[PDB]
Write a protein that binds this ligand. Structure first.
Ligand SMILES: [Mg+2]
Ligand SMILES: [Mg+2]
Ligand SMILES: [Mg+2]
Ligand SMILES: [Mg+2]
Ligand SMILES: [Mg+2]
Ligand SMILES: [Mg+2]
Ligand SMILES: [Mg+2]
Ligand SMILES: [Mg+2]
Ligand SMILES: [Mg+2]
Ligand SMILES: [Mg+2]
Ligand SMILES: [Mg+2]
Ligand SMILES: [Mg+2]
Ligand SMILES: [Mg+2]
Ligand SMILES: [Mg+2]
Ligand SMILES: [Mg+2]
Ligand SMILES: [Mg+2]
Ligand SMILES: [Mg+2]
Ligand SMILES: [Mg+2]
Ligand SMILES: [Mg+2]
Ligand SMILES: [Mg+2]
Ligand SMILES: [Mg+2]
Ligand SMILES: [Mg+2]
Ligand SMILES: [Mg+2]
Ligand SMILES: [Mg+2]
Ligand SMILES: [Mg+2]
Ligand SMILES: [Mg+2]
Ligand SMILES: [Mg+2]
Ligand SMILES: [Mg+2]
Ligand SMILES: [Mg+2]
Ligand SMILES: [Mg+2]
Ligand SMILES: [Mg+2]
Ligand SMILES: [Mg+2]
Ligand SMILES: [Mg+2]
Ligand SMILES: [Mg+2]
Ligand SMILES: [Mg+2]
Ligand SMILES: [Mg+2]
Ligand SMILES: [Mg+2]
Ligand SMILES: [Mg+2]
Lengths: 200, 95, 85, 113
RNA sequence: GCUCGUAGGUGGUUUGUCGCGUUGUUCGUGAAAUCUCACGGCUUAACUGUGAGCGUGCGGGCGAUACGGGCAGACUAGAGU
RNA sequence: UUCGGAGAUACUCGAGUGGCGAACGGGUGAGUAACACGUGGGUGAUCUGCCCUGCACUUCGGGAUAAGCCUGGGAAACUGGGUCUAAUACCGGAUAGGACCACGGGAUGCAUGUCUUGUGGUGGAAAGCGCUUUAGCGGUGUGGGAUGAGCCCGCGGCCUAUCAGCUUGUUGGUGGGGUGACGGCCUACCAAGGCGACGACGGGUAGCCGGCCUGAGAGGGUGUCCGGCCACACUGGGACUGAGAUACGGCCCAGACUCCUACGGGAGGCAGCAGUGGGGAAUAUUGCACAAUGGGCGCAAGCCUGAUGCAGCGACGCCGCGUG
């Protein structure tokens, strides 16, 4: 399943603009609904819960899928917030967002879901495909000379590209240098209140 | 018509039985002796070393063993319903 | 029976039972004659009954009726029964 | 009779196999005496490995191979080096290999500049 | 309620010894799967292949003797006369 | 050539004899508190078809009989008699040490001893068939492997003392018997023991384990899929055959239940797969295939395989993806 609902509504409740650029948000940054302008009780559980929601609606991950990402992140060496945001940053629909081929996250998900891409010459259509080190991310020859793929040819500049991946010229393809560590991760959220959420 | 007609066996090493030492509790059993063995082992949950005692039977080829009598044993084939041990020798008999 | 080959094998079990029983019944009487001849204390008949009884135990063991260790244990008990006599 | 037989232990549509020394009075996926190789009939040649020194022990003591295992021993040269047939060298063939993960990755950095 | 005492548990100072407990090492064994880890394959995942751990143990061999215990003595502070 | 009668000579093959298999595979968890299982040993106390290899041999004879044919009984299920014919069926000899007895040496130790060799006296096997012209498969005795198995022991895993005296083949010995093997396993005789508050004898419940669930661990709960071992096959008991039997789809007796009968007598056993009824909160198709893997028989082609491979049905679970 997906969410398939209003997107500004879950940025107002979480008090954080999750998509890139929104004029509906910042006219009302307070939570939606009819009791929205309240000064609410900030529980310790509320600060851990709403921090976990900030990552599910940034990346578009259901709860059972997001929990399995936590299962291996707590189980790998290093930290837990480092490795949870790493394996969320390695999903294919997030890689397409960081490379500039899509304006938002939800249009990055369809272009992977509708099968407009390859990775190692292999046709893929799964949005939670996790890329690894040295993975080329190619693109279908049918998907060239298409409107959403050529409307993102001239808009290659307004968003920055992170250091761990790289885009090239008119043969559009994305090269993964290594897995992203921490510093080149975009931060709307802290990474310790998610770890403290699953200890309850 | 070349071979030796007797293939020699692969040398299998003679495995050993179990030898133990204990006192003597009974002797009135007509070429049979009763030996109280004992062994100590940890408790599985608490870790204290618990001392327990068994009572095995053994074969006297000649009835020379009385009460007391540190005796050495070696276990054998079944010799009766309950006898599985044989007397090897008596070291430091009943003082 | 239901399976066709178990009707067949039911017939061959009885023929093997009658064959094994007549051999085993004659071995009892061969031993029994030796036990009476060794109870007479003769050592004349009991020398040559022992040679014919031990020959019959060998032939039963070659016909698969008794086992070869069963022939060995019964020959050794009749031969030692003569050495006491 | 001691048999050298195959043991199905893959997925539903992926029959992986182990070359195992077993008894004939034994089901397929029971206790084998010893595993002496493997066989994956899903690669493009196949993926055949026999231990080939423990195979020479079990053949020299009387283990009869089944008919797929007998074909495998002829490919690996084990049945030929046991019976004395002249084809004792291994006529098995691996797939033509792929360029590795780094070599293709650098050849895209070489082509983009 | 209080004491006496059976089995049992626990035991001062010191010499020598044994190597049962304990501890070191090595061999044999602890099936496969499952589980942990790392790579591979199913478009990804579940699933599955391989490698290494794990399998806390048990048996055999060879070292150590501080502590516990056994055996053979010494001691007087505890205990008793 | 009959105009639907022929020719075993002949590939081929119903029924029959003979061989091998049918003890595996598949199922279930009633019984079982036990050497059942787990783990580690012992077997100088044992067996082991088929398979591999070393070494010997494959020699004379004989009497039947199923089938067939002809008849009798019986409602059936089945069964009687007379003739008739084979064999790798069966039976009897010759020679062949790993049977046996006595005496020997030689090595060996872990007490009974074991292993290897010597003399003397007793002994025990076999089977052929096929062949286009390198068609080829078999037989028996013994050495050694491999494999499967039996048996004994250490240790480990429930509750209950409002169960405290249990035990007479009981505990040990001797002589015989018995078994593949040790052994009160059985028997006679002699001794008077054995076990127990470290729970005997009773009672209650339970297949055990690899594991699974939980938990920071230590623990606690559990034994479902899959894999191992065990137990059973309507209830109870027994043996036969065989290398090997709890003999699911064998036998015999007894019992319950269902069915057939001419009332004299007979038949049956889904806890195999599928399915029906019933019980229940509740658990699926009277499916396809031997293409793969494993097994049985065969020189082989092949034949058999509800093992297995797959499909159907149920959101029953997990995982993944859509509904923009
Ligand atoms: Mg889902
Ligand atoms: Mg037949
Ligand atoms: Mg008579
Ligand atoms: Mg005897
Ligand atoms: Mg009071
Ligand atoms: Mg005391
Ligand atoms: Mg002290
Ligand atoms: Mg003490
Ligand atoms: Mg394992
Ligand atoms: Mg993986
Ligand atoms: Mg992969
Ligand atoms: Mg796996
Ligand atoms: Mg050790
Ligand atoms: Mg004083
Ligand atoms: Mg026929
Ligand atoms: Mg044959
Ligand atoms: Mg069976
Ligand atoms: Mg004739
Ligand atoms: Mg003859
Ligand atoms: Mg002769
Ligand atoms: Mg008596
Ligand atoms: Mg005796
Ligand atoms: Mg006797
Ligand atoms: Mg006796
Ligand atoms: Mg029960
Ligand atoms: Mg706790
Ligand atoms: Mg089960
Ligand atoms: Mg079941
Ligand atoms: Mg029933
Ligand atoms: Mg028999
Ligand atoms: Mg049967
Ligand atoms: Mg049935
Ligand atoms: Mg059924
Ligand atoms: Mg109902
Ligand atoms: Mg088949
Ligand atoms: Mg086949
Ligand atoms: Mg199915
Ligand atoms: Mg579904």
């Amino acid at each position: 399943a997906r969410y398939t609902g209003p997107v500004t509504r879950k940025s107002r409740r979480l008090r954080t603009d999750l998509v890139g650029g929104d004029q509906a948000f910042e006219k009302r940054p307070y939570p939606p609904g009819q009791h929205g302008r309240a000064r609410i009780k900030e529980s310790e559980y509320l600060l851990q819960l709403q921090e976990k929601q900030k990552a599910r609606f940034t990346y578009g991950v259901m709860e059972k899928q997001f929990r399995r990402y936590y299962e291996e992140a707590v189980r790998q060496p290093g930290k837990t917030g480092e490795e949870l945001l790493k394996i969320l940053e390695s999903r294919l629909d997030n890689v397409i967002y960081r490379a500039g081929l899509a304006r938002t996250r939800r249009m990055a998900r369809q272009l992977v879901s509708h099968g407009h891409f390859n990775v190692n010459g292999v046709h893929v259509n799964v949005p939670s495909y996790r890329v690894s080190q040295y993975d080329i991310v190619d693109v279908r020859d049918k998907s060239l000379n298409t409107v959403p793929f050529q409307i993102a040819r001239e808009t290659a500049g307004e968003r920055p590209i992170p250091s761990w991946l790289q885009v090239v010229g008119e043969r559009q393809r994305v090269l993964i240098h290594q897995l992203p560590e921490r510093a080149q991760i975009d931060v709307p959220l802290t990474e310790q209140l998610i770890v403290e959420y699953y200890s309850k | 018509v070349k071979g030796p007609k007797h293939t020699p066996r692969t040398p299998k090493p003679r495995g050993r039985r179990k030898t133990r030492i204990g006192y003597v509790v009974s002797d009135k059993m007509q070429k049979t002796i009763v030996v109280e063995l004992e062994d100590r082992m940890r408790h599985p949950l608490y870790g204290k070393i618990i001392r327990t005692t068994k009572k095995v039977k053994a074969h006297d080829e000649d009835s020379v063993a009385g009460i007391g009598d540190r005796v050495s044993l070696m276990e054998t084939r079944p010799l009766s319903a309950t006898k599985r041990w044989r007397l090897v020798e008596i070291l430091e008999k009943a003082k | 029976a239901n399976i066709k080959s178990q009707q067949k094998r039911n017939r061959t079990n009885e023929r093997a039972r009658l064959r094994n029983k007549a051999v085993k019944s004659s071995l009892r009487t061969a031993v029994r004659a030796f036990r009476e001849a060794a109870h007479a204390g003769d050592k004349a008949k009991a020398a040559e009954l022992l040679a014919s009884t031990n020959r019959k135990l060998d032939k039963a063991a070659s016909k698969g009726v008794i086992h070869k260790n069963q022939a060995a244990n019964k020959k050794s008990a009749l031969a030692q029964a003569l050495n006491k006599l | 009779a001691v048999k050298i037989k195959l043991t199905r232990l893959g997925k539903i549509r992926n029959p992986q196999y182990r070359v195992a020394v077993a008894d004939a009075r034994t089901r397929r996926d029971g206790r084998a005496i010893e595993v002496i190789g493997r066989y994956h009939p899903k690669e493009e040649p196949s993926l055949i490995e026999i231990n080939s020194e423990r195979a020479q022990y079990w053949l020299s003591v009387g283990a009869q191979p089944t008919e797929p295992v007998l074909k495998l021993l002829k490919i690996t040269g084990d049945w030929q080096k046991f019976k004395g047939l002249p084809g004792a060298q291994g006529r098995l063939k691996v797939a033509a290999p792929k360029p590795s993960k780094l070599e293709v990755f650098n050849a895209a950095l070489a082509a983009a500049d």
